[model samples]
Structure formats: C-alpha cells, structure tokens
Target: VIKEFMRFKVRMEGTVNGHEFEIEGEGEGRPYEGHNTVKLKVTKGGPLPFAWDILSPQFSKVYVKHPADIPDYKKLSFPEGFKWERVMNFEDGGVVTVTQDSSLQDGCFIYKVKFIGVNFPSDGPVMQKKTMGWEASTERLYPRDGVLKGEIHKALKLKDGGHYLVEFKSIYMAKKPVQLPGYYYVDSKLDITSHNEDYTIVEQYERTEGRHHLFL
Candidate 1:
C-alpha cells in the first residue's frame, strides 16, 4: 500500500523592491517507502510578505521521482530538452507537504510539486565569505541565484506495453546560508555520468521552520 500524489497551481505577479511581494502557492506529495515519508499540501495567493528582503529573498520547492525503473544519482545536470528520473529536496517554508519513501523505487508513480519566488543565493558552499556583507560581494548571479529547479516527469511502461513520457530538469542549490537561523540543509546532487558509472553524491536535509515552515 504505497502511493503518492500531487497537484498545485500558483501565481504571484510583481513588486519586489517595494517591500510588498506575492508568490501564490500550491503543493502536494504523499508517499511512504523507507522512512523519509513525503506528504505536502500548500496554499497561498496574491499579497504575501512574511519576511525576506532584497528582492523576495527565496522560495522555491520541488521533489518528484516516479518509477518503473529509474535509478542513478550521478550529480544532476539536465538541459537540452530536459529529462530527470528522480529529484529530491524539501523542508523550507511550510505549506504542509512531505511523505518521503526511501529515495525512489517501488511502483505506481505520479508526483508533482511547485513553490516559486526565487532569486536567492547570498554566498553558499558551506558559508563563510564575510557572511555576504559587502553588497552581496559583487551581485552578479541570476537564474534565481545558484540553483533549485526541478521539472521531472517519468512514466515508462515498456515490455511491449507501450508507454513513454520522460521529462527531466533537476537542479538544487544552497549548500549554506539560507538566511541562517534554525536548521537549513538543501543538497540534492545526482548526475549519473551519462549512464556510464563511477560518480555519485547524494544528500538531502532541510529545515527552516520559522514563518516559512520547512520540516524534516
């Protein structure tokens, strides 16, 4: 009895430097496999300004991994049309959603998650760069500053069964400095050497439980 589900649609127009921001939210995910347990449900629309300055600080969450056979954490790097079989990273800004199931590998796959606002990366890599004081040191980092991009959709029913739909896009960054408060650990690096082997680094742990609501 292992199952997972998701459905969320968000919209948050403009206004960043005015101290007034909005990032509509929606999220979902429920599945229990090896202990991680993932169950999520989010809600938010229009005017939203709980905290975080400097142009919306940060807010983007996504974790999707469907199976039928897709396992290989190489290092995560998907571009050129996109295609990722697995992606993981949660616990940051509570909307309530998470019920992990041991990485990924079981059956009945279908997962979708979204929470975007982006533009955050004040020096990471285990922190320490004067704590990013001197005007972000230089301020030259776009694409939502660093990483956090997961667009995954995998549905394979082969063996003459006829079923194919593989869409991938994975990238999670923020190895440090998530505003520094309570717990904050976001590390989802998997890029399986083009199916060659020899190269694997996996780590996922998040927690910023305070106004944002990111658990476990």
Candidate 2:
C-alpha cells in the first residue's frame, strides 16, 4: 500500500452575503492509519472585501500538516520546507499540531479524528489568548424520514472584537460505497458569516449544489 497520497485542485466557492468568496485546496488521508492534512487558499474576499493582512502575504493561502512522526509513533522525521510545532499527542492515535511562518499569519491547522476511548476535552476554544481564539462543533442528527445528516460549526474570534462563523451541512450519502475503487459523491451546503461584537453583520457567503468526491 502507498503510505502517502494526496488529492489536489479541489475547489469551493460562493458568496459572503452578496460579495464573492472562494477557496481552492487539497487534502490527503492515511485511510485507517489515523492521519490527514488540508491546505487551502482564500483566492477572493478573505476576511472582508479588501482585508488581506489577516491571512498573510502568501496571497492568503494556508498550509498545515499533522502527526509530526515523533518517537512514540513512526519515529519519522518532519517534512522538509516547512516549520512545525508539536501541539498535542495521545497514545491512542490522536495528535494535534501546527505549522506557520515567522509572522504566524499563514500556516496549516491540525485536528484530531480518533478518540480511542480517551477522554479529551472537545469544548472551549482550541486556540486562545489576548489576541485570537478558535472554536468548533459537529452534530449528527437523525431525521423522521430516516436519513442521516449532520452539521458543522466553527468560529474565529479576534482581539479587535471581530469574528467569523463557518457552517456546513450534508447528508450521510448512504448509497455511496465505503471502499473506494472509484468516486463517492457527497451533497452538501456551506455558509460563511462575519460579524462585529455589536452583533452587526459584516459580510456573509452561501454555497449550494456542492458535491465532493473521494477517489481511491
């Protein structure tokens, strides 16, 4: 089996309440091995119509990879061409880490997917301090029609009393094959909202007719 693989040129875009917003990205996963990475670029309308400083000079592009390959696991070396920081690690195949540049503006974000009977706090902000913070939640729901669906919510808070909310909803794609020898289709919707502490809307974006594919 090929231990490392990646999917490229995935695109997602819509409107932030009227203005245009879009993202192009790539992802990689290790199947049952408990590891993945996502790198994305905010090509337009990032952090507002003309606010580019918030995302850094790399054209507001972000890159992050995880599971630094420490002594406990594969005992592997870090990937070249990027600076990495070890954030959290668990014995049960759970790890969280980050990578960024000197200015700390553009970088890759990491998270956990497996708990393995471990009690890790999934609430509160993932990153917090005097300047910025992050929070996220995922909910699985069962409808009366017997279709499995879910929603994802995430927020980013800034010191200047500004914030952004991103949401995603999708069906479970029950008929999709679990094993990929081809492609699996996922239908979904996405929304983006920006606000001030006074509860005023700064901007918003919505995406529909969104379909995703996974090739194995």
Candidate 3:
C-alpha cells in the first residue's frame, strides 16, 4: 500500500479579562478566549462525509496515523507553562492535539500533521521552526510555486486493513512572559524551503478526478 500526506497551518484569536485575586496569590485572569478550527475534506468521486461508506469497502477503515517523534514538554524552554490537549476521534478514527499559547495576552499558534497508508515507506510532511513561521495573508502571501507540485511521503506504518483520518495540534511560546490573550492567523509558504523535494504525495483524493471519485 502507498501512503500520501499534506501539511497546513492555522491561526486563531481570543481575549483577556482582568486580574485574579486568590488566597495564595494574585494572578492575571482571562475572562474569554476565541478559537476557530480549520478543516479540509477529501472525496474521491463525491462529498467526503456522505461518500465515506462507498470507499470504506475498497479500503479497510479510516484511522489516524501517528508519527515517530512526539514532541516532549520538559525539554521545551518557556517562561510560562504550556497547555496541551488532544481531541479523540470516534466517528472516522481521527485525532487533534491543541497546545495553547502561554500568555493570556494575544498571539498566533501553529501546528503540523502526517497521514499514513499501505505503501512500502509512508510519506508525509516534516517542518522545522525556521522553515515554518506566521504571517498575514493580506500581504499577498499565496501558495508557494512548485511546492504542492511534489509529493509528501508518510513515515508511519500501518496494519493490513487500516485507513486513516488524522488531525494536528501545536505548542506555543512567547518572547516575553505574558498570559496568552487571543488568537491569530498563521501565514505560510510551501515552496520557500529548500528540502521541498524530499516530501512526496502518492494518493490525492481531494484534488484528482474531482470529488467522490474514490467512493463509487
């Protein structure tokens, strides 16, 4: 079996309230926080949600594939503590990890994902700190040239009859010590990095042959 994958980032915004007064000590309090989820659907010949059953028989079942290197917390240097959370998958066998920014002030968050399948060596995207950063789309920072043209190989191994629905999460850091307040967008460029050729995509259900082609 061959495995294909894609990598993308998101931006969110939120707010802060006031200061907190407690018995042990006084701390800043964030009254409200705003966050929005970015999502994409994959369909071989039709819409993904309704057409999943059609393709389900052709493959085993859809599940989330985990990469080898799961980022550790203790080694992460931060003035404030970071919050990490994962959303479990039940419906389509997917999972999402959310790592909140340390400050309650205001900033953006970034994350990555990897998808796996039956191919000999699964292919997926790998992003380092320098290559990946945040920006504003209004600046005309569109998709990079020749970036999506290549393929992304997956590194995760899978069982004989397992399909995948994978989600991603992030870990945030602030230059100064401040409670992360709100959310913001993370502008990205795919072709900007040099190692673009290493990533390859084998199966593209969303882009090729139109929608729902995989179902029927």
Candidate 4:
C-alpha cells in the first residue's frame, strides 16, 4: 500500500460558513460572514477558506522532505519561559513542535512550521497547518450536504503562485482573519489530507502537467 500520512497545526473550529467570491480586480465582493447560511443559492461547489498565515511571501517553502532533516527545537532560543514539545512527527524528518507558556495553558499555542538546512536559516513555512475534508467547502457552495458524500478530490498548495480558472462558487463569502484580497478556485485532484480530506490544503505539481493547479 502507498503510505498515506498526516500532519497537524491547527484544528478547524466551528461550522465553515461561507463561499463568497471576489475578483482579483473585478468589481465588488460578495461576503457571507454574518448572513443566514440556511439561505444560500450557490450552484458551483463549496469553496476553500484560507488565512494569510500561509499565503504571505515570508511563510513560504518551509518543508524538508527527509525524516532526518527536522531541526531540534531545543537548540533554538525564544522568549524566556516558552515551552515546546514535538507533538507531531512524520515518516519524513518534518516535525511540528508546539510552544506555550509553561504556566498558562488550555489549548491555543504559538506555532511555527518552518524549514531549515545546514547552509541556510529560516526557510519559511510549508504545510504546517491542515484542515478537515468536510470543512474545505463550507455551506456556502450548493449545500455542503454532499461534502461528506465521498472522498474529497482536491488539494491546496502553499506555493507562491499558480493559475487556473478562478470562479466564484458561493455568494456568502466571509472575510477571514487577516485575509488578503484574492480570488477562490478549486482543483480537480486532491491530497486527501484527512478522511475523509485537500480540496486538505496544499499545492502539488504533477509530472506530466506543465504548471501548478490550485485547491484553495
């Protein structure tokens, strides 16, 4: 069997609530943040929701493909009492460590999914975070009733740039945290990041394919 794997960063919380589409430079944006999710007229499909935490130029390309490559976080220095642990690891050297105040704890912790090499420091962020399959396309598109129907068939790449047909699938799009103004599009193939998941949220390049196809 081909080895399937998973990585973690943040667990998605709450019901995914929109699929509004905005043009790169079109006219206006259709937001769905506070609208009634029960009254949607989307015909395309559910759309992917992303924040700038993964898109900006600084947080790009933070992945090391080998299992022996992940850095020992112990050597790095942060603010005074920050505690970190290797909560997540994979077959490859890529491991995700979480840091928090040793005294104050509940859930949310400061995260850094970065890459480094022997010759370089701070290689930026790769696919440090992941989203569930069902949440990929919130109720904005169609009805989200079919999201759990079968295996998801899409992936979201964290690369800098790529192109495909950018179409608006839902009208009730809500602006997310620190969301950069951009268009939303979907891909034909996906990474299945979870069960029962892309269309989980990372970009991939196919061999025969000329360029990059997007999932988010």
Give the Cα lDDT of each candidate.
0.24, 0.29, 0.20, 0.20
- Using alpha carbons, what is the TM-score of model 4? 0.16
Cα lDDT of model 3 by residue, 48-78, tens digit: 1111211111110001121123121211223
On lDDT, the leading prediction is 2
Q: Cα lDDT for residue 100, model 1?
A: 16
If both were scored by lDDT, which would come out higher, candidate 1 or candidate 2?
2
Q: What digit string (tens of lDDT, one per residue) describes model 4 on residues 1-216?
A: 001221212211111113232211001111111110011111222233432222111110111121122221111121221222212222223322222222111321222322111111123222323322211321111213211011112223334543111111212111121111122222221122211032223332111111122343
Candidate 1 TM-score over all chains jointly: 0.19
Worst 10 residues of 2 by lDDT: 70-79
lDDT by residue (1-216, candidate 1, tens digit) is: 233342323333333223233333333333211112222211222232322211111212323231323221111221111121222221121121112111122332232222232332223210111111101111111133433333433232333344333233344343332321221222222211111121111112222111212333
How many clashes does the backbone of model 3 have?
A: 43
Q: How well is each residue in 1-216 modelled by candidate 2, as lDDT tens digits?
A: 123432223343333224455555544444223333335555555644323211211111112121232111111211211121222332223232222221111232222111011122232222122224344333333332332333445444545575644343433222222211112222222222444542112322212121223223
Model 3 regions more than 4 Å off: 1-77, 80-177, 190-192, 196-216
Give me the displacement of residue 175 in model 3, in angstroms: 14
TM-score, one value per model: 0.19, 0.34, 0.19, 0.16
